Amino acid sequence: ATFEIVNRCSYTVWAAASKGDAALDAGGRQLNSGESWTINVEPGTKGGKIWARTDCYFDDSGSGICKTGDCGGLLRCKRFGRPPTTLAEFSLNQYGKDYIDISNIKGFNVPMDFSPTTRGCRGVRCAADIVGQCPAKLKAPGGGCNDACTVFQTSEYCCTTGKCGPTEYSRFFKRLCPDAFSYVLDKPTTVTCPGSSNYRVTFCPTA
Numbered sequence: 001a002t003f004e005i006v007n008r009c010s011y012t013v014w015a016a017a018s019k020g021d022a023a024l025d026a027g028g029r030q031l032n033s034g035e036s037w038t039i040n041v042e043p044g045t046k047g048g049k050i051w052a053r054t055d056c057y058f059d060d061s062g063s064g065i066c067k068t069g070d071c072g073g074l075l076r077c078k079r080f081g082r083p084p085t086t087l088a089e090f091s092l093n094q095y096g097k098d099y100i101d102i103s104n105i106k107g108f109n110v111p112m113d114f115s116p117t118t119r120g121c122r123g124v125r126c127a128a129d130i131v132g133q134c135p136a137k138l139k140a141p142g143g144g145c146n147d148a149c150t151v152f153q154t155s156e157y158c159c160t161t162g163k164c165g166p167t168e169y170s171r172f173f174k175r176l177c178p179d180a181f182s183y184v185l186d187k188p189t190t191v192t193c194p195g196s197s198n199y200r201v202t203f204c205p206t207a
Contacts, residue, residue: 007031009204084144126177
């Protein structure tokens with residue numbers, strides 16, 4: 001399948017695409033403003049993620065640091081990113097359908113549209129100034145708006161036992177992006193698409 005990753009923000013991002021224990025395609029790439037990067041993701045992939053990283057540095061080989069979303073200091077992510085990271089999430093060709101979501105469960109760093117480029121299903125978006133408003137205790141120095149599990153490490157925020165409810169903090173993300181997951185047990189805003197669909201991830205969409 002095809003993912004076209006478009007940086008419509010006015011600042012450079014470093015896009016990332018991982019499943020957790022391996023890269024997807026090249027695993028990451030600088031996208032200056034306006035730059036599109038199309039990747040190939042192998043059908044049937046379960047649990048992949050696409051995110052932006054901000055304020056990175058990489059050297060000639062590729063090793064470095066980012067202030068949001070860092071994946072173990074690699075330009076080319078083979079693992080997931082340090083919060084706060086707005087997340088595009090997907091598992092493809094499940095049993096006849098792909099399922100797409102955007103998640104604020106690790107926080108928010110960059111606004112995002114995640115839309116299908118082939119018919120049958122509707123996209124999802126979170127474009128609101130979450131970082132402009134973000135509650136002080138959830139702010140991240142380095143940029144972005146952390147989730148409460150990251151800041152406080154409680155069973156209720158982290159839904160450790162499989163039981164938890166919404167919170168003042170989950171609800172701050174759900175007031176501003178009802179289509180994105182706001183905590184682990186949120187009512188799913190998942191989208192079911194035909195198996196083998198293609199997609200576009202657009203950062204800073206409304207930019």
